[PDB]
Amino acid sequence: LALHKVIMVGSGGVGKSALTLQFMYDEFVEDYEPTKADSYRKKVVLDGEEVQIDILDTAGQEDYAAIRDNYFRSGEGFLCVFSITEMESFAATADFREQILRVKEDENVPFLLVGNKSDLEDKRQVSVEEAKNRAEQWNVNYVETSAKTRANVDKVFFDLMREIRARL
Numbered sequence: 034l035a036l037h038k039v040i041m042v043g044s045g046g047v048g049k050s051a052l053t054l055q056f057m058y059d060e061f062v063e064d065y066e067p068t069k070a071d072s073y074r075k076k077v078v079l080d081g082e083e084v085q086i087d088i089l090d091t092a093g094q095e096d097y098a099a100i101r102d103n104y105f106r107s108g109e110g111f112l113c114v115f116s117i118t119e120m121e122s123f124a125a126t127a128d129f130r131e132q133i134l135r136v137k138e139d140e141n142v143p144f145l146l147v148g149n150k151s152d153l154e155d156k157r158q159v160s161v162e163e164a165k166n167r168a169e170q171w172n173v174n175y176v177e178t179s180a181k182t183r184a185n186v187d188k189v190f191f192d193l194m195r196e197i198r199a200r201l
């Protein structure tokens with residue numbers, strides 16, 4: 034089977050684990066240990082082809098730069114998550130983008146900008162416009178998700194796999 038290696042990146046509390054666990058187990062998990070990194074593997078039927086997705090849910094604990102870079106080098110695609118309710122998490126996406134680009138040396142690395150917590154519109158700190166503008170500057174797609182309601186959860190994982198399939 035094709036193996037699509039996806040890495041979840043983003044600052045703390047944005048919903049990396051909640052997105053991963055909603056995709057894997059169809060549950061909204063609100064208390065997943067913030068410091069725990071884990072990998073998840075699932076067989077999925079992508080546009081009618083059975084593939085395996087491997088998701089690395091990062092938790093920011095790896096501080097040794099060579100090891101972090103080694104992990105990013107192994108990844109084939111990235112979900113770069115921020116929370117629409119935390120502007121600083123959106124600012125932080127620039128750092129993950131640069132880290133990925135330094136390692137992959139390919140501006141067309143499969144990569145989605147993911148604005149999570151779309152069910153908290155009344156707490157929005159990041160405008161759709163500014164996120165779309167950043168995605169346009171980077172030539173990536175912007176998708177808003179909710180790990181709580183499941184909105185666009187399958188979409189971000191499937192669309193990332195579609196970019197891996199097309200580009201690699």
Ligand SMILES: Nc1nc2c(ncn2[C@@H]2O[C@H](COP(=O)(O)OP(=O)(O)O)[C@@H](O)[C@H]2O)c(=O)[nH]1
Nearest residue numbers: 045046047048049050051062063150179180181
């Ligand atoms: N309302 C809402 N809460 C969310 C969403 N995603 C995550 N959360 C909550 O935000 C907190 C942090 O989520 P988590 O997935 O652990 O963030 P991580 O540090 O990026 O892995 C938890 O309390 C989750 O319930 C979402 O889409 N909507």
Ligand SMILES: *S(=O)(=O)c1ccc(S(=O)(=O)Nc2cccc(Cl)n2)cc1
Nearest residue numbers: 070090091092093094095101104105
């Ligand atoms: S490793 O398998 O020993 C490992 C994997 C992931 C982490 S982390 O997610 O806690 N930290 C982190 C930070 C930036 C990029 C990445 Cl891939 N991971 C630790 C150890």
Ligand SMILES: [Ca+2]
Nearest residue numbers: 049050067092
């Ligand atoms: Ca987490």
Ligand SMILES: [Cl-]
Nearest residue numbers: 070071072089
């Ligand atoms: Cl791991």
